Design a protein around this ligand. Structure first.
Ligand SMILES: O=C(O)CN(CC(=O)O)[C@H](Cc1ccc(NC(=S)NC(CO)(CO)CO)cc1)CN(CC(=O)O)[C@H]1CCCC[C@@H]1N(CC(=O)O)CC(=O)O
Ligand SMILES: [Y+3]
Length: 180
């Protein structure tokens, strides 16, 4: 007993650049997820199209405590995960993976960034032995130059993803900034 799935395969990592000479101190702080792409099934619930935000807090041990917030079903929802430096600067694994049920593999790779406007970051993970990947386009503001968005689309297609697996969330006020 169980289940079936059909997923676009994760690309070979030779298709996924790594930011040269990654600077963890320059990367820390608040980012908006201005574009999202991945092999997971796109979801209908229109409320999910709202932009979310993340905070990368660099710790003394060089790990980040990463907090995301989204405005969902009238609530601010918060999720904090720990990113441990991986094999190469700009890569990370997941701290305390035993406490994520059904999650057996997790990898983060920063593809490119100029640290004070934008970033693209690649994620790959195995959740109930299905392989997912995603890419995020991060902005220091909630809006990004069109060319950055066009670059993000082309890079996502190059990894085998079609347009319908690529989205630009709608900016919002609730939760991701907070209060006047
Ligand atoms: O990443 C975002 O900014 C919006 N995400 C959605 C999305 O990418 O489509 C969620 C939003 C989120 C918020 C609260 C709850 N609350 C619950 S689980 N309780 C659940 C969903 C937050 N995600 C977790 C998720 O996607 O499962 C981030 C959480 C902190 C670690 C970084 C992580 N992702 C960063 C990224 O995608 O660039 C990587 C990743 O997703 O693996
Ligand atoms: Y996410």
């Amino acid at each position: 007993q169980d289940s079936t799935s059909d997923l676009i395969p994760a690309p070979p990592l030779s298709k996924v650049p790594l930011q040269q000479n990654f600077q963890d101190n320059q990367f820390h702080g608040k980012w908006y997820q201005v574009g999202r792409a991945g092999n997971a099934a796109p979801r209908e619930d229109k409320d999910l199209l709202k932009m979310t935000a993340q905070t990368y807090e660099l710790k003394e041990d060089k790990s980040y405590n990463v907090t995301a917030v989204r405005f969902r079903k009238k609530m601010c929802e918060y999720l904090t995960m720990t990113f441990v430096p991986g094999s190469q600067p700009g890569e990370f694994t997941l701290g305390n993976i035993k406490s994520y049920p059904g999650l057996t593999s997790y990898l983060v790779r920063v593809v490119s960034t100029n640290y004070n406007q934008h970033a693209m970051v690649f994620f790959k993970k195995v959740q109930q032995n299905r392989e997912y990947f995603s890419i995020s386009l991060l902005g220091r503001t909630k809006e990004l130059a069109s060319e950055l968005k066009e670059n993000f689309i082309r890079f996502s297609k190059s990894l085998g993803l079609p347009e319908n697996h690529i989205v630009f969330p709608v900016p919002i006020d609730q939760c991701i900034d907070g209060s006047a």
